[PDB]
Structure 1
């Protein structure tokens, strides 16, 4: 019979690729359907380029793709409309904001799979050791705590110890980190939902100068090459006070054999001042049936399975990844394993989106401009004032003649 082939997630990031292959194989066994899993590179912008080769070719060689939350506007032509396959009641079991995000010109491009938000990981043992009772609420507090704890841990002989790690590589992850910096300084959304390109302002410029000031000081010089996993590995070895990352890192840091098991918590990222908005960049993954799949019925069935309550529960319990079904946030087993799912729910609900709705199919070009200009601040090439001006100009060229 048919072989249903899935491209989604990556074995290069934590357990997500291994787990996804396990889920697809479970579906195959349950239904008596042959399946194959095609692996992907770690970074989402690299995954997009890979998948675009198949789409450009109208290739039937992948039936189901795991797509980023920023992609529906780009990928819609390549997606089978799922709307006729789901009842209104089935669709209402997901968060309506995510179903909306996935709907482009009426086409339900994909089912919500897991959501995501940037959060602050912190070493509770170290905060206690150095006389701190709570994680930092402001970026200045974060800098002060990092400097003090670094001074102490270095003096004690840990030459590998840093204050803060994050994603500073030039790729989509840096657009996420930078939106959080900019938005948490009251600098706006880079491109506002209405289309206004707002980034050329002093709050945005200050946010980027602040981030530059961390590099080689409280963060490694090499942070300008870090994606999720490079940051995670410094952190998980016990060598960073703080880390910005996504929910997946939590289960991995709690695993048996992790040096930091039981030594950390999570909270909302800091902000410039008490009246700035909290920033958590919205992330996550959706499940798309290929427009070019020869087996739409079977592929839909697989996507419904992967998006089901029990599969999302397993993702939550074993991989600490955020459900797209509100009902799971009240499930006793999800909450006993990840109590912070409840504590941080309002942070996840108020997550700030990158400008993928307003940029639509041009989002990847906009993001590349963002991460390249931001990276130029991190590397010391430009100051934040020049970078936000240059970024404004670049995005204006990209979006000229584009309307949402």
Structure 2
């Protein structure tokens, strides 16, 4: 009978790949269907390039793909329209915002699987050791606390200790960190949902200059090569006061034999001043049935299972990844394991989106311009003022003649 083949998530990032293959195998066993799991590179933009090879070839060799929240506009031609397979009631069990994200020109490209948002991880033991009673609310506070804790920890002999780690590698994760910096300084959304390229402004420039000011100071020099797992590993070995990362790092940092188990909390990222908006970049994964799958019916059943209440629950409890079902945020087991889901739910719902809706199929080119110009500031090659001006010019070229 059929073999349903699934490309999604990466065994190179936390436990996602392993857990996903487990879920797929469990569906296989439950239904008596053969399945195979195809692994992927770590970085989402590398995964896109890989999957684009299959799509270009109209390959039937993958039936289901896990896609990023930024992809529906790019991948729509390669997606089976899911809309005929779900009732309005079934669809309403997911966050409307994400269903809408995943719907391009009325086609439901994919089902919401897990969402995501950038948050601040902090060492509560260290904050208390140094006389602080709350995590920082402003970037200036983050910097002050990071300087003082680092000076103390370094003096006590931890030469590996830093104040802050984040994603500064030139790749999609940097676009995410940078949208947070820019938006939390009142500098806008880089490209606004109406199409306006707003990024050339003094607040955005300041946000980038501030980030530059972290590099090799409160953050490792090597941060300009860090993706999610590089940041996480410095943090999880106990060597960073703060980290910007996604929810998944929480369950990993609490696991038995984690050096930082019980020593950390999470909160909303800081901002420039009390009247700036809170910034958490919207991330996450959706499940797409390939337009080139020879087994659409079976693929859709697998996607419905993966997106189901109990599989999302398992994802939440075991991997601390965010459900796309509002009902799971009131589930007693989910909340008992992850009490911060309740506190940060409004942060997750107000998460700020990268400009994938407005750039559509050109999003990946837009994002590359963003991470390359941002990276130039992080390395001290350009000032934020120059970079945001060059970025405006590049995005104008990229999006000239594109309409949403």
Q: Whole-Å Cα distance in 1 between the matches of residues 35 and 64 of structure 2?
A: 11
Give the deviation of 1:170 after TM superposition: 0.2
- Measured after TM superposition, the shift of residue 51 of structure 1 is 0.0
1:136 deviation in Å?
Answer: 0.2
CA distance in 1, matches of 2:15, 2:349: 25
Structure 1 residue 85: deviation in Å? 0.3
- Between the aligned partners of 1:359 and 1:146, the Cα distance in structure 2 is 37
Instruction: Calculate the TM-score normalised by the size of structure 2.
Output: 1.00
Partner SS state of residue 182, structure 2:
helix
Q: Deviations over 1:101-155 (max 9, x none)?
A: 0000010000000000000000000000000000000000000000000000000
Q: Residue deviations 1:290-343, cap 9 Å, x none? A: 000000000000000000000000000000000000000000000000000001
* Partner-residue secondary structure (3-state), 2:125: helix
1:5-47 deviation per Cα after TM superposition (whole angstroms, max 9, x unaligned): 0000000000000000000000000000000000000000000
Deviation string 1:163-218 (CA, Å, 9 cap, x unpaired) is 00000000000000000000000000000000000000000000000000000000
Unmatched 5+ residue regions in structure 2?
none
Report the Cα distance in structure 1 between the residues aligned to 2:369 and 2:216, rounded to whole angstroms.
Answer: 24
- TM-score w.r.t. the length of structure 1 is 1.00
Distance in 2 of aligned mates of 1:346 and 1:75:
29
**How far 1:351 sits from its partner (Å)?**
0.3
Q: 2 CA distance for matches of 1:57 and 1:209?
A: 43
Answering whether residue 106 of structure 2 is matched by residue 121 of structure 1, we say no
The aligned residue for residue 104 of structure 1 is: 104
RMSD across aligned positions (CA): 0.2
Pair 1:257-2:257 in alignment = yes
Q: Measure, in 2, the Cα distance between the counterparts of 1:311 and 1:108.
A: 21
1:339-378 per-position Cα deviation (integer Å, ceiling 9, x unaligned): 0000101100100000000000000000000000000000
Other structure's SS at 1:344 match: helix
Unaligned runs of 5+ in 1: none
Give, in whole Å, the separation in 2 of the partners of 1:326 and 1:96. Answer: 10
